[PDB]
Symmetry: D2
Subunit: 116 residues, 4 copies
């Protein structure tokens, strides 16, 4: 898969399960248009968001819905969500893994980009 | 100073100097509208963005212009910018820090009571 | 495997390949004794360090040799290595994944602990 | 102040207060020996560990006693402590920061010239 999202919970030391993820792409009029969405699995991973055909060059935003995640665990966190905004596929198709490590008042995000 | 932003560079072990930072507030039509902006100083900090009177409860976004910072250094980065989106709550000082690398960033909020 | 180490390079956006990892365990005289070692693969992962039988309760240190990694890429980094020190298996056997995200003047480390 | 240590708590969004910090230097027999120590202040910082005269080039270790910090808050942590090992080089001020969570930490070094 050309786009995978992995989310981990730094309070529990576990995958962050059932985290909602929304992906948008910038349109020709420079607005964000819905591109794909899903929820992380028991492994903290979200696969199957898109295909190589559909994932053309563009500016993408991966929105990870961290506030809803934390609230369900009894934590009122600082952020509304974690946002990851990047140009994709501007040098040809790549595979992207976006990882996010979550705490209530912090997060870290890292991308691994590979050429298939 | 109810809101301060600090940006650090994890490639060079330094403050991230002259980084543009833009703050937005959510308007009634649920759109983002410009609220304040500036560039980080030689210590990587940006003070004086807003005042207590102006910084009312609401949802804000801080957008740190990391791509241009890395381009100026000749380093290829992943992200267009870093985004920190949060609600201000009167329930008193917010420090938003961001630690920047070319393909990763970490952001932390310190919320303290004067 | 009960102990796995994963290392990523935040400058390149890639797995950190051929990173040396040394694991130690505290001995009865409170000194660090060699426990296992290896190098990360092309995926940034190091498997096969130990077995469930050998990985008894104890205090362990995973030493990730980050300075040698960076120097080979032309970077003189800040740290000598990244150290991860933890009690393991004190509530019965667990599986541990230790991840480290590396930059020249920073690193992040996260553990995922699961019960098999 | 050639060496400062700052510790932050990512669960509460605050400085990490009253955290014990121990600094070691490598001795000639390649063993670690105590060099300096203290506890972080209400701002999460620890100043005054050493002096310019004393902080000569060499390999140092900073060990932040995170387990006891989390135990006092009633939170189960992963690590015994956080360790930052580095060489001091005369090639001038070191700030070591650590952002703490129960199963993760991030550490950053800012090296600046006065």
């Amino acid at each position: 898969c050309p786009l995978m999202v992995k989310v981990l919970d730094a309070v529990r030391g576990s995958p962050a399960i059932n985290v909602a993820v929304h992906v948008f792409r910038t349109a020709a009029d420079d607005t964000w248009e819905p591109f794909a969405s899903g929820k992380t699995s028991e492994s903290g991973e979200l696969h199957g968001l898109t295909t190589e055909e559909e994932f053309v060059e563009g500016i993408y935003k991966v929105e990870i819905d961290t506030k809803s995640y934390w609230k369900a665990l009894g934590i009122s966190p600082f952020h509304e969500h974690a946002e990851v905004v990047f140009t994709a596929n501007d040098s040809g198709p790549r595979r992207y893994t976006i990882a996010a490590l979550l705490s209530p008042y912090s997060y870290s995000t890292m991308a691994v980009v590979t050429n298939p």
